[PDB]
Amino acid sequence: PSVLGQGSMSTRIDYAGIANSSRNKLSKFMKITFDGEPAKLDLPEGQLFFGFPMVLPKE
Amino acid sequence: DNMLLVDDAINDDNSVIAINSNTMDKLELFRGDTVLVKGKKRKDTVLIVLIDDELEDGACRINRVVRNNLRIRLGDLVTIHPCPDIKYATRISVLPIADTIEGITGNLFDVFLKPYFVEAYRPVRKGDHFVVRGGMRQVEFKVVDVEPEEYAVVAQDTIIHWEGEPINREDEENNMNEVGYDDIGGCRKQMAQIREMVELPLRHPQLFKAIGIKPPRGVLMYGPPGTGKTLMARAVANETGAFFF
Ligand SMILES: Nc1ncnc2c1ncn2[C@@H]1O[C@H](COP(=O)(O)OP(=O)(O)OP(=O)(O)O)[C@@H](O)[C@H]1O
C-alpha cells in the first residue's frame, strides 16, 4: 500500500524531504534507503509515527 | 615570456593585471582576456589582462589584494598563462569578512556587491578575495563556493548567495598552518636532504621509472626537542602540494 512510506503524517512531516536533505546534507549556497546517516527527527510531546519504511523479515 | 615583474596597480580592481604592449604581443593575448597567474607556493588565480604601454618590458601591475592572495610582495615574479576556457559561474556563495562588517547595517549585498557585479565579469576562483568600496567604507568578500568549479566568471546569470556566518579573519592563519621554506632558517642542508627525497618521488615520478629504481619510502628525522622538526615537515608538505596527513 501507499501508506508504507507515503501516507498521512508522512506529508505533514516531509520524511522524504528530511531523508533527501540528510543524504545531501550541506548548506550548499526520489527514494529513501537505510544506507546513509541518520538525521534528527523531533516531534512534540504526544505524537507517534509508524510510517518508517518496512524491511520485511530475513527470509 | 611568462615571467614578469610585479608593479603596484594604480586602479582599484582585484581581477585586473596590466601588461606591456610588447609583453602582450609576446604572450599573444588581447585586451580584456582572462589569464591564469601563479605565484609562490601552490597559490594561483585568474586576472583580466589589460594593456599598459607605460609598463616597461617584462613588468606587470597587480594590486595589494592579488599580492596577498598569491603570497607575494612588490617586485616578485609570477607565471602567467592564457585562460580562455574560463566559464561562467552559475551559482556562487560568498560571505563577508567579520572584521569588515563591524556594525555595517542594511543589505550588504545590494549596497556593495551589486555595484561591484553590474556586468563586471570579474573572474573568480575558490579561495579568492576582493574588497568593494561602498559609501565611505570598504568591505571584503571571499569566494566561499562556486559552481561550476573551479575558476569561472561572475556574470549576470550567476546566482549569488550571501547568507552565512561572517568569515573571521584570524582563523585563516591562526587555525591553519601555511608555512613555506621562507619560515625555516639555519637548516639548509637538512632541508635539501628532505626535499630531494620527498618532492622528487612525487613532483617528478617519471624519473625513477626512466632509471628503473624504487626510491626509498621511509624517512626518520631526529634531533633535540624544539628544533622545528614538525615545522620542517609541515613546510615540506605544503611546498610539495600533495595531500598531507
Ligand atoms: N628554523 C627553525 N628552527 C627551529 N625552530 C624554528 C625555526 N623556525 C621557526 N621555529 C620556531 O621554533 C618552534 C619549533 O616548535 P615545534 O613544535 O614545531 O618544534 P619541534 O621540536 O620540531 O616539535 P616536536 O618535536 O614537539 O613536534 C616554533 O616556535 C617554530 O615557530
Residue B235 CB neighbour total at 10 angstroms: 23
Question: What's phi and psi for B145, nearest 5 deg?
Answer: -155, 150
Q: Min CA distance, B154 vs chain A (Å)?
A: 15
Task: Decide: helix, strand or coil at residue A48.
Answer: coil
What is the C-alpha to C-alpha distance for residues B88 and A27, in angstroms, rounded to an integer? Answer: 22
Q: How many beta carbons lie within 10 A of that of residue B145, not counting itself?
A: 18
Identify the bridge partners of residue B78 per DSSP, sorted by sequence position: B4
Q: How far is B124 from chain A (nearest CA, A)?
A: 16
What's the CA gap between B179 and B185, in Å, rounded? 12
* Cβ–Cβ below 8 Å for B92 and A28: no
Give Cβ neighbours of residue B76 (< 8 Å, ≥ 6 apart): B6, B39, B40, B67
Resolution (A): 3.8
Cα–Cα dist B144/B148, whole Å: 13
CA angle A43, A49, A55 (to 5 degrees): 130
Residues forming a β-bridge with B161: B93
All residues at 6 or more sequence positions from B204 whose CB lies less than 8 Å from its CB, including other chains = none
Q: Which three cell numbers stand for residue B23?
A: 609583453
Residue tagged 526520489 (cell numbers) = A30
User: A43: buried, middle or exposed (CB in 10 Å: 19+, 13-18, 0-12)?
Assistant: exposed
- Say if the Cβ atoms of A27 and B159 lie within 8 Å: no
How many C-beta neighbours within 10 Å does residue B223 have?
Answer: 11
Q: Which of B:225-244 have CB within 8 Å of A?
A: none
The Cα B142–Cα B68 span in angstroms is 13
Q: Cβ < 6 Å from ligand 1: which residues?
A: B 183-187, 225-231
B29 within 8 A of B104, measured Cβ to Cβ: no
Instruction: State the DSSP string of chain B.
Output: --EEEEEE-SS--TTEEEE-HHHHHHHT--TT-EEEEE-STT-EEEEEEEE-TTSPTTEEEE-HHHHHHHT--TT-EEEEEE-TT-EE-SEEEEEEBGGGGSS--S-HIIIIIHHHTSS---EE-TT-EEEEEETTEEEEEEEEEEES-SSEE--TT-EEE--S--B-STHHHHSS----GGG--S-SHHHHHHHHHHHHHHHSTHHHHHHT-----------STTSSHHHHHHHHHHHH-S---
Beta-carbon-side half-sphere exposure of residue A37 (alpha carbons within 13 Å): 8
- Backbone angles phi and psi of B130, in degrees to 5: -155, 140
C-alpha grid cell for residue B108? 550588504
Q: From CA B6, how far away is CA B62, in angstroms rounded?
A: 7
Q: How many CB atoms lie within 10 A of CB B70?
A: 20
Q: How was this structure determined?
A: cryo-EM
Q: Which three cell numbers stand for residue B12?
A: 582599484
For A29, nearest residue in chain B (alpha carbons): B93
Q: Kindly list the strands in the beta sheet with B152-153, ordered across the sheet, starting from the edge strand earlier in the chain.
A: B87-88, B152-153, B123-124
